[PDB]
Amino acid sequence: MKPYQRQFIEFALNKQVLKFGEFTLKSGRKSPYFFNAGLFNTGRDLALLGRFYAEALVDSGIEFDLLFGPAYKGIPIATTTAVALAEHHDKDLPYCFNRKEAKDHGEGGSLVGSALQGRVMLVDDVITAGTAIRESMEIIQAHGATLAGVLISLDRQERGRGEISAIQEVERDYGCKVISIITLKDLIAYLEEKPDMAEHLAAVRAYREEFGV
Amino acid sequence: MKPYQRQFIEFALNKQVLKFGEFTLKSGRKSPYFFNAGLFNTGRDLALLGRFYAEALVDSGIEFDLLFGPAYKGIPIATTTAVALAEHHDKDLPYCFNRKEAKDHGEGGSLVGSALQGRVMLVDDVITAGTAIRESMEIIQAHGATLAGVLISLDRQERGRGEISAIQEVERDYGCKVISIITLKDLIAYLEEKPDMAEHLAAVRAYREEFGV
Ligand SMILES: O=P(O)(O)OC[C@H]1O[C@H](OP(=O)(O)OP(=O)(O)O)[C@H](O)[C@@H]1O
Numbered sequence: 001m002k003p004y005q006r007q008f009i010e011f012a013l014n015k016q017v018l019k020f021g022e023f024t025l026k027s028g029r030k031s032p033y034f035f036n037a038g039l040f041n042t043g044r045d046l047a048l049l050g051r052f053y054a055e056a057l058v059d060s061g062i063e064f065d066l067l068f069g070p071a072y073k074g075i076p077i078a079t080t081t082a083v084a085l086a087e088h089h090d091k092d093l094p095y096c097f098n099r100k101e102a103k104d105h106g107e108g109g110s111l112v113g114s115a116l117q118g119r120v121m122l123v124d125d126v127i128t129a130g131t132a133i134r135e136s137m138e139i140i141q142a143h144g145a146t147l148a149g150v151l152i153s154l155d156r157q158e159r160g161r162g163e164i165s166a167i168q169e170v171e172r173d174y175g176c177k178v179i180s181i182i183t184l185k186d187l188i189a190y191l192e193e194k195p196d197m198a199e200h201l202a203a204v205r206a207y208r209e210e211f212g213v
Numbered sequence: 214m215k216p217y218q219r220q221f222i223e224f225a226l227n228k229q230v231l232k233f234g235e236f237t238l239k240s241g242r243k244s245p246y247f248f249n250a251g252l253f254n255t256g257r258d259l260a261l262l263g264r265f266y267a268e269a270l271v272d273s274g275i276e277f278d279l280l281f282g283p284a285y286k287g288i289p290i291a292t293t294t295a296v297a298l299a300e301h302h303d304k305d306l307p308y309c310f311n312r313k314e315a316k317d318h319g320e321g322g323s324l325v326g327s328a329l330q331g332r333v334m335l336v337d338d339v340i341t342a343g344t345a346i347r348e349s350m351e352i353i354q355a356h357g358a359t360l361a362g363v364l365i366s367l368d369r370q371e372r373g374r375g376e377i378s379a380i381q382e383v384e385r386d387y388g389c390k391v392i393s394i395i396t397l398k399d400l401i402a403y404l405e406e407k408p409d410m411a412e413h414l415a416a417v418r419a420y421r422e423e424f425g426v
Pocket residue numbers: 070071072073074124125126127128129130131132133325
């Protein structure tokens with residue numbers, strides 16, 4: 001597992017974005033850990049998150065022409081990732097986001113920033129159901145842009161209602177790739193190193209057993 | 214005029230965010246220059262803008278507990294300013310923004326990020342009418358937070374419908390202070406140094422005559 005990976009977990013933990021306990025997922029599953037990015041709500045968190053996002057992008061080697069932050073949660077994300085790319089990776093890219101706004105019987109469309117033009121890299125925190133981007137791929141697909149990939153923080157890698165993960169469905173219905181900073185797998189790997197976290201280890205190990213993909 | 218001021222104008226110009234020509238303002242005035250922040254739509258612009266915003270904040274010496282980016286245009290702003298503060302000024306602050314969302318007969322409320330708590334520094338691009346924050350001070354004022362100030366890019370310093378500028382009204386109806394990176398005054402000062410911009414100088418000088426506050 002990579003260096004920026006390990007630091008990621010550490011920061012997540014630290015800001016208590018990662019928690020070990022007993023949490024009920026949206027799906028209704030009882031889960032032994034949770035990840036709430038909602039809790040990265042500070043200047044420096046923001047600074048730190050963008051730097052991790054950029055790394056991951058960069059380490060992917062995927063080609064893309066622009067960042068696109070969705071709904072609401074993706075804007076500070078796209079925004080921070082975009083500054084991160086240019087201050088540290090010397091990559092200067094265009095950004096863009098949509099107005100959720102739909103004030104008149106129909107949907108939205110409306111965008112802020114650069115033009116939905118080219119290979120678009122989607123950017124979000126987490127994908128639980130994989131439905132929110134399905135909204136957001138439609139916009140891309142309308143403007144005639146193409147999808148490069150999606151980048152999130154965590155791939156939980158557990159089945160959905162079927163036998164594949166929500167992520168595999170998105171990758172599968174969208175013919176794109178989903179990149180992430182960390183997976184379940186790294187989580188474990190990490191917990192393996194921390195002798196006095198064996199109780200969490202065990203529980204996360206067991207969950208991956210009953211539900212992991 | 215300050216150093217980060219001068220560089221600001223230069224960047225604005227460069228990205229053509231500042232333009233000299235003939236533009237019809239929202240007010241209906243014909244104006245000799247225009248400023249469209251809408252055109253800062255790139256990673257590095259974003260990086261560069263936050264750095265200018267932070268400077269200005271910092272150079273103000275006003276005390277505040279949090280950044281608040283409004284509607285839509287203020288989020289990447291608040292977001293970028295917040296990373297700027299923490300990476301370069303060693304100030305780590307909380308941020309927050311609202312969802313314009315009002316999906317059910319009434320208004321909104323709904324916030325993302327830290328808690329509307331404490332002395333709030335408002336953050337936006339420009340104030341033409343000064344009405345959009347009046348929406349945004351109501352939220353602050355609801356949650357029982359207090360207003361520290363407002364920070365924008367440019368103070369056009371021209372009268373409104375009355376004899377004072379939209380900014381003086383806001384400062385005046387809100388009992389707060391509005392900080393900015395650059396004013397008309399600096400614009401001129403700048404144009405004074407650039408011998409072959411005398412045509413713009415003249416026109417901006419004349420406008421300040423007929424309408425300046
Ligand atoms: O993969 P899904 O089940 O579709 O959900 C994933 C999304 O859940 C939240 O969306 P939300 O619409 O609540 O965020 P917002 O605050 O930006 O509106 C969060 O911002 C993720 O983007």
